[PDB]
Amino acid sequence: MASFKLATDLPEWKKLEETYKSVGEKFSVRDAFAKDPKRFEEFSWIYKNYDDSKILFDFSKNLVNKEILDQLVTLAKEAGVEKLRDAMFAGDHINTTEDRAVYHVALRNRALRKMPVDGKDTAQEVDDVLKHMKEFSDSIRDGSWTGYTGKSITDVVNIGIGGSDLGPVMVTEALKAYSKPGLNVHFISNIDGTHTAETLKNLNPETTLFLIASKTFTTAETITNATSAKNWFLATAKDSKHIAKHFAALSTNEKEVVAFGIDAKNMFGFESWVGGRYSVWSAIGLSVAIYIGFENFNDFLKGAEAMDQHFLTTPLENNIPVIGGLLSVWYNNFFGAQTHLVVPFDQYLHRFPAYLQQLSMESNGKSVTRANVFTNYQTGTILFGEPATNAQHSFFQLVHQGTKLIPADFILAAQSHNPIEKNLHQRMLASNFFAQSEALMVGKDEAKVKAEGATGGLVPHKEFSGNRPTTSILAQKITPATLGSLIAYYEHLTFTEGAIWNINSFDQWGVELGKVLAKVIGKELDDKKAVATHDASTNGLINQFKEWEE
């Protein structure tokens, strides 16, 4: 049980409402730098990773000062962020609505600390599956695991959706510099048949390995897609006994895996207490281990592990994911900003925002607290983004000159995996990273617009308000370890947010209605008889489809 019902009940929440009116709403970042010559030092933190690599988190261009952050910290203490965190790490069933542990932290327990669920250490069982993942990925990569005609595997297709897809996609894209030429990964996720047809078009069944990734192993799209891949494989291979060399499963559900015709020796298991949107660390990351090798995958886990130890052991006021979460609440609940922009100045990280969208929004898009009452305040933010410099030429116009507050996180690596032309492109990329946050803060007033040459009614069109907040995250390099630490940062930021809002960040009851309603309609699409069983819009859309379908 929670210690409180609603976040709005916490005494510091009421205090922050007043602080918002007196100091927050008209906060001047320019004035803050001028008041405090140590602002950068006070509002930036160096994270040191397990391998002594570093990441600078600079919050100093945010609409925050010591007064405000101290209050947000007091709010975090009243909301029991620490008690909930420690319960999570203790293996307690803090996913209250499903009565489950929340133990993604245990997936990357490479130190083999004691980490019990139901009073039973999980360290060894997690480790065993990783050992299996190492053996199998090494086999694929060295060419000793051969297909049904005795050939080495050249292509691996992950089939899965949401938590079983976005992670493998994002991380294989992000760490693509660590891949081996000739060993390619592919993804089928959408039920849209285009996805199957386009992905299998040029693949050879003799040298293609499928990974069927589903926590439940009952997701409608995934089982259907896996059946279609099995059909495609057998159209060439003919005999079902060959499936054992070409189909593995990443799942919690051994029963359904085996019922599907996948051998238990080819299952890479995980438990219920791994949420899908926190599963890349598990068996789900097998595609990653194959693409870039197990040791790199282990390094990614150990980056998460080090950020977990940071989150667990650091006082709130210096606790980097906590500070990120506190600013989010500040913007979401006091300013009323609805969005949170995440912009990697990194092409490899192009699918990093899409990944964070699930982690953040599926966790925190809730309307009911742990005391089982409805919120009377905003919960999860809408998270979006694209890589820079692309994003500068898409929607940054609105970020600079629009009417909406859009808290933004910019991410850059100091070193590129691709330092072509003796780093000409890298320095240009970096210059944009620095200048965009600079621009958003400093703006450009009327006087400067006039000095730069505009007259009359053109003048206001060229003004920049400035005072637009950013968080800058500078890594040395986007290694596996760095990426693991960065994801864990957003995981614990997400944690802090949900803890303050007193929501359950770890369930997803909101997907069930669409699932049940789609099955009903799917049966109705088995003929071309007009339907009148729904609302008139749903009926009209279905009936128009029936007239227009093949």
Ligand X SMILES: O=P(O)(O)OC[C@H]1O[C@](O)(CO)[C@@H](O)[C@@H]1O
CA distances for 320 relative to 91, 379, 394, 489, 546, angstroms = 23, 21, 30, 8, 54
- The yes-or-no answer on residue 492 being catalytic is no
| Closest approach of ligand X to the CB of residue 450, in Å | 23
Minimum distance between the CB of residue 329 and its own copies, rounded to whole angstroms? Answer: 13
Nearer CB in complex with Cl ion: 8/207: 8
Residue of 227, 162, 94 lying closest to 514 (CA atoms): 162
Partner in contact with 214, chosen from ligand X, Cl ion, its own copies, none, beta carbon below 5 to 8 Å by kind: ligand X
**Binding residue for ligand X (CB under 6 A) from 91, 205, 276, 469?**
276
Q: Does 219 bind ligand X (CB under 6 A)?
A: yes
* Distance of alpha carbon 299 from alpha carbon 281, whole angstroms: 11
Q: Is there binding between residue 71 and its own copies (CB under 8 A)?
A: no
Residue 216's binding partner out of ligand X, Cl ion, its own copies, none, with CB under 5 to 8 Å set by partner kind: ligand X
Q: What angle do CA 132, 137, 138 make, to 5 degrees?
A: 100
Q: Which is nearer to its own copies, 36 or 263 (CB)?
A: 36
467 makes contact with ligand X (CB under 6 A): no
Nearer Cβ to Cl ion (403/455) = 403
Picking from 517, 548, 542, 518, the residue whose alpha carbon sits closest to that of residue 530 is: 542
User: Between 2 and 405, whose beta carbon lies closer to Cl ion?
Assistant: 405
Nearer to ligand X, 393 or 425 (CB): 393
Single out the residue of 118, 142, 239, 535 in contact with its own copies (rule: CB under 8 A). Answer: 535
DSSP-derived 3-state class of residue 503:
strand
Spot the catalytic one: 362, 386, 491, 497: 362
393 in active site: yes
Non-local CB neighbours of 260 within 8 Å, separated by 6+ positions? 212, 217, 223, 226, 249
Distance CA 406, CA 336 (A): 10
CB of 354 to Cl ion, least distance (A): 23
Q: Are 488 and 307 in contact (CB under 8 A)?
A: yes
User: Is-cis flag, bond preceding 8, omega within 30?
Assistant: no
Using CB under 5 A as the binding rule, the residues of this chain from 367 to 406 that contact Cl ion are 405
Per CB under 8 A, the segment of 75-83, 125-133, 264-272, 376-384 that binds its own copies is 376-384
Q: Per CB under 8 A, does 264 bind its own copies? A: no
Query: Would you call 515 a catalytic residue per the annotation?
Result: yes
* Residue 353 beta carbon to Cl ion: minimum distance, rounded to whole angstroms: 21
Please, which residues have CB within 8 angstroms of residue 99's CB and are 6 or more apart in sequence? 93
Residue nearest to Cl ion (CB): 405
Structure tokens at 103: 């133990």
Structure tokens at 228: 């279609």
Residue type, position 34, single letter: A
HSE-CB of 361 using CA atoms within 13 angstroms: 16
Q: Is 266 in the site for ligand X (CB under 6 A)?
A: no
Residues 373-432 that bind ligand X (CB under 6 A): 393
440's CB contacts (< 8 A; 6+ apart) are 61, 399, 400, 408, 466, 468, 469, 470
216 binds ligand X (CB under 6 A): yes
Residue 354's φ and ψ, nearest 5 degrees, are: -65, -35
Restricted to residues 414-453, the positions that interact with its own copies (CB under 8 A) are: 414-421, 423-439, 441-444
| Residue 215 interaction partner, one of Cl ion, ligand X, its own copies, none, beta carbon < 5-8 Å per kind | ligand X
Residue in 145, 156, 250 with CA at minimum distance from that of residue 209? 156
> Which is nearer to ligand X, 178 or 495 (by Cβ)?
495
Binding site for Cl ion (CB under 5 A): 405
Binding site for ligand X (CB under 6 A): 160-164, 214-216, 219, 222, 276-277, 362, 393, 508, 511
Give the catalytic positions in this structure: 362, 393, 515
